[PDB]
């Protein structure tokens, strides 16, 4: 029923700036209000949106009463501007970043990273988006008519306690399994409708759950075609009835849009510990899509970009990541994260091959790398499916083990470290992450 909010497509000013503000307020959930968190407003955030190539200057206020981060998570830039949790703003504080695209057009994001606590602080509210734009897709006739027929889609859960407030503590249930909970929100909003013009519809879908994975699909069965995933562009559009989605991911599909016929994007059940709950044991819709008459913008096109080979692995540094839970401690390499001490230095520009196992247990541990988009090599025992085998910033790991072929193209430094972690937040919080320099 209400109508889906459309985050800011916030470009720079005259200056060259881009302001964000970070800050407390009020947001309104079946009638009921909480107080929530957001960027430039009280939930969520806006769209960022960068060229390659353009450096921009972004200038962060935290107005909360507690320390914050912002990470950019899919960027590639250095250490010094990632917004890991050595990244501190203080409260009242002011940061200046400048921000130096140098990656292909992709829908990447942005998200607190502060140290132990950033599954509260996504739960509380602050999530925004980045749009990089570049020459190559703007020649591609995708639609492009931000929040008509280029939308941004936000799927998150939260569970709220009776008195309507958002309800997080990272208790031994929450730290094990994930903070879930069972009201679906969709840009902020509780089953959104969202008025699309006839014709082809783009949405650029965004797991912002702290634990949920999701799984994509529309009420009618109709396809959805996979364009993009985290890093961008896929070579050609993958066709898809269902599209998992893992915590932190990114894809962005085309949907047809016909006169007559309003359908649902809806989510799918899924096999994961805590998941499966009501009401996410049936299919649980997302939004409504609205068939609307008014001007469409573009169409699918048969072939996207161009990906590069996979490069040969002989003589490539392999490194050994093995995920692990034991009682209440999550690690890596048998060590809780531990920010005055980077585990390995990896190398500025070349290729490694980094090999992460989940052996050991059956949770699912979507791993994320800053400081690069990369090539998944295999995924949890098998190749990659076709639409997640371009650029990715997170591979699945559950049960088994994932090869990823990764590359650095910025310093960070062990003051500026860069994160590697599982991005299900409370195993994040909990110790499930290492930090990693790059270079000097
Ligand atoms: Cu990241
Ligand atoms: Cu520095
Ligand atoms: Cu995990």
């Known amino acids: 029923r209400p109508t889906l909010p459309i985050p800011d497509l916030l470009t720079t000013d005259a200056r060259n700036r881009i302001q964000l503000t970070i800050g407390a307020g009020?947001?309104?959930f079946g009638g009921k209000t909480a107080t929530t968190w957001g960027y430039n407003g009280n939930?969520?955030?806006?769209?960022?949106?960068?060229?390659?190539?353009?450096?921009?200057?972004?200038?962060?206020?935290?107005?909360l009463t507690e320390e914050t981060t912002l990470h950019w998570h899919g960027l590639e830039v250095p250490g010094e501007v990632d917004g890991g949790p050595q990244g501190i703003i203080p409260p009242g504080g002011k940061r200046s970043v400048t921000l130096n695209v140098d990656?292909?057009?992709?829908?990447?994001?942005?998200?607190?990273?502060?140290?132990?606590?950033?599954?509260?602080?996504?739960?509380?509210?602050?999530?925004?988006?980045?749009?990089?734009?570049?020459?190559?897709?703007?020649?591609?006739?995708?639609?492009?008519?931000?929040?008509?027929?280029?939308?941004?889609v936000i799927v998150q859960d939260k569970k709220f306690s009776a008195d309507g407030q958002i309800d997080y503590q990272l208790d031994v249930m929450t730290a094990a399994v994930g903070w879930f909970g069972?009201?679906?929100?969709?840009?902020?909003?509780?089953?959104p409708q969202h008025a699309a013009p006839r014709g082809w519809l783009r949405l650029r879908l965004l797991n912002g759950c702290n634990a949920r994975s999701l799984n994509f699909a529309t009420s009618d069965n109709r396809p959805l075609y996979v364009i993009a995933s985290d890093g961008g562009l896929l070579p050609e559009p993958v066709?898809?009835?269902?599209?998992?989605?893992?915590?932190?991911?990114?894809?962005?599909?085309?949907?047809?849009?016909?006169?007559?016929?309003?359908?649902?994007?809806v989510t799918l059940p899924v096999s994961q510990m805590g998941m499966a709950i009501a009401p996410f044991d049936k299919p649980h819709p997302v939004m409504r899509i609205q068939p609307i008459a008014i001007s469409a913008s573009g169409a699918l096109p048969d072939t996207l970009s161009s990906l590069p080979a996979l490069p040969s692995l002989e003589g490539l540094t392999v490194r050994?990541?093995?995920?692990?839970?034991?009682?209440?401690?999550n690690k890596i390499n048998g060590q809780a994260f531990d920010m005055n001490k980077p585990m390995f230095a990896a190398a500025k520009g070349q290729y490694e091959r980094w090999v992460i196992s989940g052996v050991g247990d059956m949770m699912l541990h979507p791993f994320h790398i800053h400081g690069t988009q990369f090539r998944i090599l295999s995924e949890n025992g098998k190749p990659p499916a076709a639409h997640r085998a371009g650029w990715k910033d997170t591979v699945k790991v559950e049960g088994?083990?994932?090869?990823?072929?990764?590359?650095?193209?910025?310093?960070?430094?062990?003051?500026?470290?860069?994160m590697a972690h599982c991005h299900l937040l409370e195993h994040e919080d909990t110790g499930m992450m290492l930090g990693f320099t790059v270079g000097h």
Not at 320 to 329: E, F, N, V, Y
């Open 320 to 329: 050994k990541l093995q995920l692990s839970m034991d009682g209440g401690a």
């Open 43 to 63: 939930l969520l955030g806006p769209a960022v949106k960068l060229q390659r190539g353009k450096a921009v200057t972004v200038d962060i206020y935290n107005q």
């Open 103 to 152: 990656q292909p057009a992709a829908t990447c994001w942005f998200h607190p990273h502060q140290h132990g606590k950033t599954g509260r602080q996504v739960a509380m509210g602050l999530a925004g988006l980045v749009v990089i734009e570049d020459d190559e897709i703007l020649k591609l006739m995708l639609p492009k008519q931000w929040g008509i027929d280029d939308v941004p």
């Open 26 to 28: 009020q947001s309104t």
């Open 239 to 265: 066709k898809v009835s269902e599209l998992p989605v893992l915590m932190g991911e990114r894809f962005e599909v085309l949907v047809e849009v016909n006169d007559n016929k309003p359908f649902d994007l």
């Open 182 to 191: 069972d009201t679906l929100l969709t840009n902020g909003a509780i089953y």
């Open 400 to 418: 088994n083990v994932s090869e990823v072929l990764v590359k650095f193209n910025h310093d960070a430094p062990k003051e500026h470290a860069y």
